[PDB]
Subunit: 399 residues, 2 copies
């Protein structure tokens, strides 16, 4: 009997992992990695947030069991998530139209949503922005759902091309899912304005789309409440939606895998039926979600003092990113960049497309030790006041 594994073709190597290996091995003291995928502070560290350490100490001192929770995880975490998303006092919450399952990250939320849709609805297609989070396609395709792209970013002019977006979505059919990033669009940082969100929400009702809001950076754009405006505009207008949320970034809990999938339906009975089937999708996967990260989040959010410490930290991170965006633009100018980069201070979150070509990206790495991913995506949290001048001089040199 030939082996079952004998003829498996290897998956393609992950180019980003390859770059990370090269960076690690690079002995040049001037090296900088703008290709990283997480927040870093001014010292280049991704620390554990103080509020998180305090919560972890409280859990250590008070947890008396690790017995299983249900398929939806920790109820307090679900309620805290819903309040962050919709606002405490939301008519949606008051009307009992939402149910939330804690999941292993936003990634887990997306897969659970995909499996739920594929097994229980007539959804055939999920529409995602061009560009979008790289992992969206694989997740939805794994559930047998087709993924189509809609127009979003104008790369030459560095804008969200809203008219192109709405026209391209005329191809989406009633009952298709259309996925929108809630804030800090990844990787462009180009977000709809509130008025644009309101236009999209109205269009979505008219066309019969099922919106799926992927929100992974609440608090990184303009603030917690502001960053939820787009989601809340959809929530005001729709009978149904799905939200995939993550606490990986805004709580610095990346490796603990903390996020949620929230269903909204027209009434309590409907959302309960749908949620029962979502649970079934979870039961066929990992069953119950990982407790530690969700416990941490619930511990912080339910305590006024800890919550204040967390909010201040998150504010500090948002403001550092904004400072680096401003400093990057000003430093490119002082280093004599031969074109305008002001789009950088019109974008939200830690990611933007630099507008550099793959050739310029390669040259930056080989000649200057400045690392970015092939798409030209850069993470401004990889910038500091101390590394800004040489990295801008390098960029200017390849333009």
């Amino acid at each position: 009997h030939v082996g079952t594994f004998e003829n498996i073709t290897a998956a393609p190597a992950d180019p980003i992992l390859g770059l990370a290996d090269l960076f690690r091995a690079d002995e040049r003291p001037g090296k900088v990695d703008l290709g990283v995928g997480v927040y870093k502070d001014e010292t280049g560290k991704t620390p554990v947030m103080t509020s998180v350490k305090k919560a972890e100490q409280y859990l250590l001192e008070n947890e008396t069991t690790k017995t299983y929770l249900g398929l939806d995880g920790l109820p307090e975490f679900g309620r805290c998530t819903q309040e962050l998303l919709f606002g405490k006092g939301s008519a949606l919450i008051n009307d009992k139209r939402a149910r939330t399952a804690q999941t292993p990250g936003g990634s887990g939320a997306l897969r659970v949503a995909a499996d739920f849709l594929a097994k229980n609805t007539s959804v055939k297609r999920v529409w995602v922005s061009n560009p979008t989070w790289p992992n969206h396609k694989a997740i939805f395709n794994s559930a047998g759902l087709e993924v189509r792209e809609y127009a979003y970013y104008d790369a030459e002019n560095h804008t969200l091309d809203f008219d192109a977006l709405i026209n391209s979505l005329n191809e989406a059919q009633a009952g298709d899912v259309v996925l929108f990033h809630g804030c800090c669009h990844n990787p462009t940082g180009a977000d709809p304005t509130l008025e644009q969100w309101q236009t999209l929400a109205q269009l979505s009702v008219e066309k019969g789309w099922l919106p799926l809001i992927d929100i992974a950076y609440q608090g990184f754009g303009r603030g917690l409440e502001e960053d939820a405006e787009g989601l809340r505009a959809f929530a005001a207008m729709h009978k149904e939606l799905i939200v995939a949320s993550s606490c990986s970034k805004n709580f610095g809990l990346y490796n603990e895998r903390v996020g949620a999938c929230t269903l909204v339906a027209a009434d309590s009975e409907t959302v309960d039926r749908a949620f029962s089937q979502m649970k079934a999708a979870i039961r066929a996967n990992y069953s119950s979600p990982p407790a530690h990260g969700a416990s941490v989040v619930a511990t912080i959010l339910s305590n006024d003092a800890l919550r204040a410490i967390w909010e201040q930290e998150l504010t500090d991170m948002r403001q550092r990113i904004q400072r680096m965006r401003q400093l990057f633009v000003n430093t490119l100018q002082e280093k004599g960049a031969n074109r305008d980069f002001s789009f950088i201070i019109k974008q939200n979150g830690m990611f933007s497309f630099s507008g550099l070509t793959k050739e310029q990206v390669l040259r930056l790495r080989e000649e200057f030790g400045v690392y970015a991913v092939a798409s030209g995506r850069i993470n401004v949290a990889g910038m500091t006041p101390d590394n800004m001048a040489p990295l801008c001089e390098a960029i200017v040199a390849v333009l």
Copy 2:
């Protein structure tokens, strides 16, 4: 437009969750829940193990980041898992034939294995024992794999009917997966002897099956090394196999979701190809696994002092279960049971089938506040020296 969720039918209610509801609403002081699915100590608690609290303190003191790990999780956890499974001095490990992905529980391991097999191999069918762990069918079916049942337990006579088992497996074709519980068969507690494992391993080689060993109770049967004998009998004989392992029960880490999927192939280059595609299946699911529980396990297993504290606790847990099995049988006899329950003494792990009818189970709950599941499965860890006499009196009364 009509709702996408409007015509979703509710999943059928989970009878066990309902029984847990009824238990909570039952105000009678003498209630005993033999229907639980986790370990409990002599006080009725599911404690955090001492070794686990110590490891958690160490992590709180020493962790400086929660940045993402890779798709396979914490390397040290993978190595420690492989050593527990295959033993020191494993030729298989020396030959670099194994790769392990940390996963969200044994459940996550089974789903990752299922998705990997469905997308990368010609496997069409997975064979499981009648009875088996309740979630096996849903997990494999979710990946598009047919699940077939093989003979295992003679309920009237309380035996592993080995001849029925091997004859029933003549229907399994070359290339099919056959799933075996590594130890403490759930829910019968009836395990193959070493000689029987060796016979199964030889048959598997002859027939060309791909074995999947699901091991979730290592340490609860006879002890860590003994409980791995069956797996190791297969390992010695096979070019390829899959192991889904769990630390939920033997580290009391249920809600942290810590387990692993281990692939074994003929050689290192082959297992690397296979594992690359397993990582792709993970990427399309929840991406990286939850760190906390795996960090705890690695911390314990890689430190001699902590490991000894863990092993001692686990031994105490195993021995308490064995003592309750003996005490149950002896108390039933002293209370005048009209039937022999000696089969209980021999069975391994926390679960056995009581042999009680559904009518007897109903009466036990309604009249005596003794709770078992409809099948008559009991968890002997729900028994204590203090509750044993009333429990046995109730059972004798319904016989």
